[PDB]
Amino acid sequence: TPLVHVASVEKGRSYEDFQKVYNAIALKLREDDEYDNYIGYGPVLVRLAWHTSGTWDKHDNTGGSYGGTYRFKKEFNDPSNAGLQNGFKFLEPIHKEFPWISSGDLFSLGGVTAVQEMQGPKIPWRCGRVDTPEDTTPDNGRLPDADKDADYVRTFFQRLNMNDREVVALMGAHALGKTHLKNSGYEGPWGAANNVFTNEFYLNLLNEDWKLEKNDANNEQWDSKSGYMMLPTDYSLIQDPKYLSIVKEYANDQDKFFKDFSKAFEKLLENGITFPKDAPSPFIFKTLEEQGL
Numbered sequence: 001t002p003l004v005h006v007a008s009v010e011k012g013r014s015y016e017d018f019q020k021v022y023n024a025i026a027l028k029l030r031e032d033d034e035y036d037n038y039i040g041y042g043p044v045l046v047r048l049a050w051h052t053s054g055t056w057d058k059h060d061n062t063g064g065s066y067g068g069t070y071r072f073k074k075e076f077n078d079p080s081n082a083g084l085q086n087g088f089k090f091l092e093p094i095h096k097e098f099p100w101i102s103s104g105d106l107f108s109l110g111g112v113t114a115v116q117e118m119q120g121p122k123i124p125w126r127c128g129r130v131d132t133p134e135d136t137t138p139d140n141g142r143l144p145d146a147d148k149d150a151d152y153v154r155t156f157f158q159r160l161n162m163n164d165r166e167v168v169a170l171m172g173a174h175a176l177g178k179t180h181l182k183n184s185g186y187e188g189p190w191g192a193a194n195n196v197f198t199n200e201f202y203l204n205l206l207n208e209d210w211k212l213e214k215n216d217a218n219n220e221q222w223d224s225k226s227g228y229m230m231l232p233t234d235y236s237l238i239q240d241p242k243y244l245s246i247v248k249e250y251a252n253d254q255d256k257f258f259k260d261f262s263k264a265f266e267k268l269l270e271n272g273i274t275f276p277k278d279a280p281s282p283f284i285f286k287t288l289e290e291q292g293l
């Protein structure tokens with residue numbers, strides 16, 4: 001038996017309870033849209049959601065979104081998480097408005113809000129994460145390096161229980177935002193539409209003219225004449241025949257991308273968690289436009 005994480009609903013709360021939390025985030029998303037040269041807080045929040053979950057090991061159920069351990073120094077100060085304090089501070093007033101929601105739920109909810117609010121697919125989400133103690137925090141080094149080839153990525157994602165179709169779809173999240181030299185040692189966007197969820201990641205991947213270069217931190221990255229970039233790990237998605245066909249697939253069909261990403265992001269956010277048979281069914285929240293706001 002590995003360790004068991006049982007989802008316990010916050011006492012007496014429900015969908016229209018968490019629906020209110022969704023609203024505060026999507027609203028704040030519209031208020032501070034000047035963030036990072038008017039990209040907004042959308043992208044950093046989905047990167048934050050991915051990083052609290054991507055620490056998971058399917059072997060012994062350590063790490064993962066359940067415990068909310070990012071709030072702890074060690075995970076917070078992980079070089080792999082540099083720049084995410086930007087998403088933490090954004091979610092902080094929202095945590096004081098609803099101090100009854102667990103960190104784990106807040107971190108995952110914010111990523112879900114962000115994807116739906118940037119016109120992406122719907123992501124069904126579940127509550128029940130409970131805060132665990134400091135020494136539950138995973139050791140640094142569990143998140144992936146950007147400087148590697150196709151089969152590093154493949155092995156790596158096996159620890160997260162993800163197959164080829166799932167890793168190609170998750171990576172489509174890289175249509176969003178940009179890399180920041182002081183954060184990761186990489187600079188530039190992957191695309192033009194920075195804060196709307198589309199299939200541009202695969203398009204650019206297959207359509208631009210790419211060159212291998214060193215950036216100002218002296219690391220290698222792929223650059224296009226258009227002013228975009230790709231990480232070595234991104235560019236391997238077309239160096240590999242199995243990844244390649246799934247990429248071509250997502251560049252032809254953005255509806256398939258949306259469904260595959262939805263399933264893969266949900267799984268990602270829930271890995272390691274056991275839900276009781278009497279747990280409330282997954283919530284599908286309405287967008288701010290679906291509620292006339």
Ligand code: HEM
Pocket residue numbers: 043044046047050082083144145146153170171173174176177178179180181183184185186231233
């Ligand atoms: C091979 C795996 C991955 C690697 C190596 C990787 C690496 C990176 C790096 C280096 C950045 C730049 C951060 C910065 O400079 O500030 C970044 C940004 C981002 N990544 Fe990933 N990533 C990976 C997979 C994913 C996944 C699975 C997701 C979500 C599903 C994701 C979502 C993002 C987002 C949204 C950003 C934008 C952050 C922002 O705009 O501030 N990435 N990624």
Ligand SMILES: c1ccc2[nH]cnc2c1
Pocket residue numbers: 071088091092093095103106
């Ligand atoms: C958002 C803001 C502050 C927090 N403290 C612990 N978890 C948090 C989430």
